[PDB]
Amino acid sequence: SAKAVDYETEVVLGNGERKKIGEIVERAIEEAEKNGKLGRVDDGFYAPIDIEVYSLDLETLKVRKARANIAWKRTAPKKMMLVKTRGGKRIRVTPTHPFFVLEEGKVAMRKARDLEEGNKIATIEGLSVSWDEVAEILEYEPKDPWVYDLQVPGYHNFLANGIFVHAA
C-alpha cells in the first residue's frame, strides 16, 4: 500500500515559493514520459527531480535544506485520513503514511491510521521546530484518485503544510 499524501499538500521549497506536491510530481512525470526516464511500479510511477526542500534532522532537531531526487505518483487507496494538530496543522495522507512521533523521550514512526489524539508529531511553529499533539484524525473517501510523495536522501522527510512529512 502507498505511503503518500494529497495533491494539495504544499511543499516548502528552499529557493522559491511553496508549491503543491501534485504539481511538482505531475510535471516531473510528464517530462520523464517523453525522455524515457519514467519508472513504473505496479500501482504508479516515479520520475527524476532536482529540487530543494527543508528537512528535519531528528537527532539534533535542526532544519536543513536538502535535495529531493525522485517524484512518486501512486494510485490512491480506497480510504484516506485527514490529520489535524492542536497547533493548527492539517494534512491529508494515506492510512499507512508514517509520522514521526515523540513518545517518552524517543522518536518513533507511527502510521496515520495508528495515531491517537495527543500523539506529538513534528511540525514548525513560525520558524521553530515544535512537537505538536494530534487533535483529530478523520477518515474520508478521496475524490482525487492519485497520491504523491518525494524521495529525500538521508533525511526521509520534507516540510509541507507546516509538518515534517515522512518521505521515500
Author numbering: -2 to 165
What does the paper say about this structure?
Protein splicing is catalyzed by intervening protein sequences termed inteins. The cell division control protein 21 (Cdc21), belonging to the MCM (mini-chromosome maintenance) protein family, is one of the proteins invaded by several inteins. The structure of the PabCDC21-1 intein revealed the HINT fold characteristic for inteins from thermophilic organisms.
PabCDC21-1 has an improved C2-symmetry interface with the loop regions at the C35 and N35 sites with hydrophobic residues L53, L58, and V60 for the N-terminal, and I121, L124, and V126 for the C-terminal subdomain (the C35 and N35 numbering for the split sites is based on the NpuDnaE intein as described in Aranko et al. (2014a) for convenience). The structure of the PabCDC21-1 intein revealed extensive hydrophobic interactions between the C2-symmetry-related N35 and C35 loops, increasing the subdomain interactions at the elevated temperature optimal for the growth of Pyrococcus abyssi. The crystal structures of the PabCDC21-1 and PhoCDC21-1 inteins showed that both mini-inteins do not have large flexible loop insertions at the HEN insertion site, unlike the MjaTFIIB intein.
